[PDB]
């Protein structure tokens, strides 16, 4: 276009992009700022960094970039490079692992009235404090503080375009759901510049994690392994396999604890819900191991080496009927040698019978102890799992 070529040559013959685009230096540049969240790329909990793809729409009037369309064949809007004009220097205060300002300098749309629209893209890696208290059912409020760096409120005034970020082009995430989003303008006095206030717009997004992945891949195996903890008390002591069950469960929960520990920040501000559950089932399994060792010791207590205490007999055999499908428990010297041998055999079987019967008393004590402990541990499993998860679950189902 020859008209637009002449216009662009005329507008930038004596243009200065250093100075603010005002007729008088005493007035401020009014800027309208609007964030458009295109995609929520990542929420790194370990490093506490939120990666978002955004478009930072900025609108402002330039005094020296006006023209009459009648003088230029009716041209009313043009597209010009942004690097050649004055721009607001909008900086993300809470940047963590990225660029502080815009680095992609896309074209600006310039109207004949001096109005400039500049909508650059950006990949903001902002800092979000990650609260782990309800992980993997946690809610995270992550903010983005955008403000002019070197221009105070007296020389450049930024205004929000809308009360909320623009989510009309937001690609839905497979891990997070944005519950609420809101942009607030703040006037802040900094110690570096105590005279004038500096303006900022903080855009915050409340995000609810979708917990299906962590439920399937972490929680369900842990529930399966914790359910097998109490079943050690239904195993007989004569099988010689109680320790196998308990120890394998303990090792599996140890591996899963490593997996969960690799998934959360090392901050000390809160203990995660899943970590609390893991420690609970670990103490549960170790208690099961201790009382299983006690049960095995009681079962194998040799009656010759151990006398039955009368209090144990009262507590376990006499007391505790509950369901009692149990029972509760001439004249040759050769002839003389035969008499002595037969008597010795009979007395030996007498002694063996009494020793065996005392052994079964010990085994019966162990059996009833196992039957009480099975019910106790099975109930404790459900009670602990509910007491951990159900509070957050009913909170989410009730909100």
């Amino acid at each position: 276009s020859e008209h637009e070529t002449r216009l662009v040559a005329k507008l930038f013959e004596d243009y200065n992009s250093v100075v603010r685009p005002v007729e008088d230096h005493r007035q401020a540049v009014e800027v309208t700022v609007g964030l458009q969240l295109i995609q929520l790329i990542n929420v790194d909990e370990v490093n506490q960094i939120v990666t978002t793809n955004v478009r930072l729409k900025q609108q402002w009037v330039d005094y020296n970039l006006k023209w009459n369309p009648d003088d230029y064949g009716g041209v009313k809007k043009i597209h010009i490079p942004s690097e050649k004009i004055w721009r607001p220097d909008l900086v993300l205060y809470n940047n963590a692992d990225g660029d502080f300002a815009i680095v992609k300098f896309t074209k600006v749309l310039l109207d004949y009235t001096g109005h400039i629209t500049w909508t650059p893209p950006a990949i903001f890696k902002s800092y979000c404090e990650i609260i782990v208290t309800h992980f993997p059912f946690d809610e995270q409020n992550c903010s983005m503080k955008l403000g002019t760096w070197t221009y105070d409120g007296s020389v450049v005034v930024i205004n929000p375009e809308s009360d909320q970020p623009d989510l009309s082009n937001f690609m839905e995430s497979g891990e997070w759901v944005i519950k609420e989003s809101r942009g607030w303008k703040h006037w802040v006095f900094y110690a570096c510049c105590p005279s004038t206030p500096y303006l900022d717009i903080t855009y915050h997004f409340v995000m609810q994690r979708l917990p299906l992945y962590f439920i399937v891949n972490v929680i369900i195996p842990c529930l399966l392994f914790s359910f097998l903890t109490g079943l050690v008390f239904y195993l007989p002591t004569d099988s010689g396999e109680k320790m196998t069950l308990s120890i394998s469960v303990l090792l599996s929960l140890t591996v899963f604890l490593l997996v969960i520990v690799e998934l959360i920040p090392s901050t000390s501000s809160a203990v995660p819900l899943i970590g609390k559950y893991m420690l609970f089932t670990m103490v549960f399994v170790i208690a099961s191991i201790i009382i299983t060792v006690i049960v095995i010791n009681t079962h194998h207590r040799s009656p010759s080496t151990h006398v039955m205490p009368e209090w144990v007999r009262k507590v376990f055999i006499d007391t505790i009927p509950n369901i009692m499908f149990f029972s509760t428990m001439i004249k040759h010297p050769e002839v003389k040698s035969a008499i002595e041998g037969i008597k010795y055999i009979a007395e030996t079987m007498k002694s063996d019978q009494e020793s065996n019967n005392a052994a079964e008393e010990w085994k019966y004590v162990a059996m009833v102890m196992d039957h009480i402990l099975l019910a106790v541990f099975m109930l404790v499993c459900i009670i602990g799992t509910l007491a951990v998860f159900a509070g957050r679950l009913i909170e989410l189902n009730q909100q």
Binding site: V18, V19, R20, P21, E23, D24, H25, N47, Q48, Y63, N64, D89, V91, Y93, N94, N95, A96, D97, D99, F100, A101, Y127, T150, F189, A191, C192, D238, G240, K242, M243, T244, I247, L250, L251, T254, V255, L258, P265, S266, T267, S268, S269, V271, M282, I286, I290, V293, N297, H300, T305, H332, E334, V335, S337, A338, G341, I342, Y344, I345, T348
Partner: protein, 413 residues
């Protein structure tokens, strides 16, 4: 912007940003430096790198950028791009990633008396040699060293910033910008200007400004998620002394499996500590101690099983049975065929009874051995745990930022 444009045109005529603001040669340009920590992003212990978000305030005065506000409609400040003015090439010397300069080259704020105020933001990744001797109950002394990459002492004077009569010898922390790290608490934050008196006065980087961060780890995560699990799973090893010394007792299964668990914990701990070799971590020494305790538990379980399952026909030892019983108290014509067969039956039962008695004696010997070694290993485990944890507990941060310096390097108020 008529007055701003007029002033920028007047000031930038003949201005060379590559030449120092020395009105007369041999003059030294005073550069005031202040640091404002906005967020301690991380301390990567494996890479030994401290990532910090900072605002680095640099102040100096350019005699070429003076103007009278009355000649310019009362304009008393000008925002100029930092590339068009001269700057002192202040860089972080101890950077780890090769990034020497600031991130964003924002505008400088020039004042009518020529004094330029630059305050860019930066994400600096400095080198912090991590001391691991008391991990996770440790504190680290990281440093950010700033110096001019170009100019020497005879060309610029790099000083700390001064408030109204007071020198700001500390990292500034604005409450309106600071965010607390969830893992690290800043205990001391001094600042110093170091000029090696005997160094050459012609080389550039010999006057430095060092900002130190003494940071204490918050160890709640590591105690809850790593240490207490390890302690309890090691206590499980102690329980094998109560299991019976027969088939189905399952001593070795328990002991070797808890050994595998402790090795897994050692693998987990090794991931979170650097590969340096100035010292062994506290938690690593504790893990090795627990491993050795479990190995000795396995050794004694094997010995106890061997003693308990010793056959009477194999061998006997009169001294061995004596010593355990000493310690047990502190611990607490068809008739001819008929009679021949009857005698054989009785003698067979006698032999069976004697064999059973010998087996019972061996069983008691094994039980006594297990009981005596239980208390010794419990004492070893408890003493080692208590000693290591007290050593952890007594690793406090020093009271003062610098040993030998009575000063606290904290702001007045």
């Amino acid at each position: 912007r008529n007055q701003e444009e007029r002033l920028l045109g007047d000031l930038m005529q003949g201005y060379n940003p590559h030449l120092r603001p020395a009105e007369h040669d041999s003059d030294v340009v005073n550069v005031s430096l202040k640091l404002t920590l906005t967020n301690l992003i991380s301390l990567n212990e494996r890479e030994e790198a401290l990532t910090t978000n900072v605002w680095i305030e640099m102040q100096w005065c350019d005699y070429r950028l003076r103007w009278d506000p009355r000649d310019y409609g009362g304009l008393w400040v000008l925002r100029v791009p930092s590339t068009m003015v001269w700057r002192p090439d202040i860089v972080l010397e101890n950077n780890v990633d090769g990034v020497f300069e600031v991130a964003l080259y924002c505008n400088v704020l020039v004042s009518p008396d020529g004094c330029v105020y630059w305050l860019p933001p930066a994400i600096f990744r400095s080198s912090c040699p991590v001391s691991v001797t008391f991990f996770p109950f440790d504190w680290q002394n990281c440093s950010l060293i700033f110096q001019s990459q170009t100019y020497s002492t005879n060309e610029i004077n790099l000083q700390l910033s001064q408030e109204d009569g007071q020198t700001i010898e500390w990292i500034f922390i604005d409450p309106e910008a600071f965010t607390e790290n969830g893992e690290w608490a800043i205990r001391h934050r001094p600042a110093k200007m170091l000029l090696d008196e005997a160094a050459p006065a012609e080389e550039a980087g010999h006057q430095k400004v060092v900002f130190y961060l003494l940071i204490q780890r918050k160890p709640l995560f590591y105690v809850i998620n790593i240490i207490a699990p390890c302690v309890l799973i090691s206590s499980v090893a102690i329980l094998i002394y109560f299991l019976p010394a027969k088939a189905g007792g399952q001593k070795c299964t328990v002991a070797i499996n808890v050994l595998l668990a402790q090795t897994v914990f050692l693998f987990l701990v090794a991931k979170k500590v650097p590969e340096t070799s100035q010292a062994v971590p506290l938690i690593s020494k504790y893990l090795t101690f627990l491993l050795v305790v479990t190995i000795l538990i396995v050794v004694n379980a094997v010995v106890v099983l061997n003693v308990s399952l010793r056959s009477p026909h194999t061998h006997s030892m009169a001294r061995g049975v004596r010593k355990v019983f000493l310690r047990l108290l502190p611990q607490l014509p068809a008739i001819q065929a008929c009679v021949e067969a009857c005698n054989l039956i009785a003698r067979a039962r006698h032999q069976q009874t004697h064999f059973d008695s010998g087996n019972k004696e061996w069983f008691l010997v094994g039980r006594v051995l297990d009981r005596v070694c239980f208390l010794a290993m419990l004492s070893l485990f408890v003493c080692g745990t208590a000693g290591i944890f007290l050593m952890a507990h007594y690793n406090r941060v020093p009271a003062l930022p610098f040993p030998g310096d009575p000063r606290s390097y904290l702001p007045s108020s």
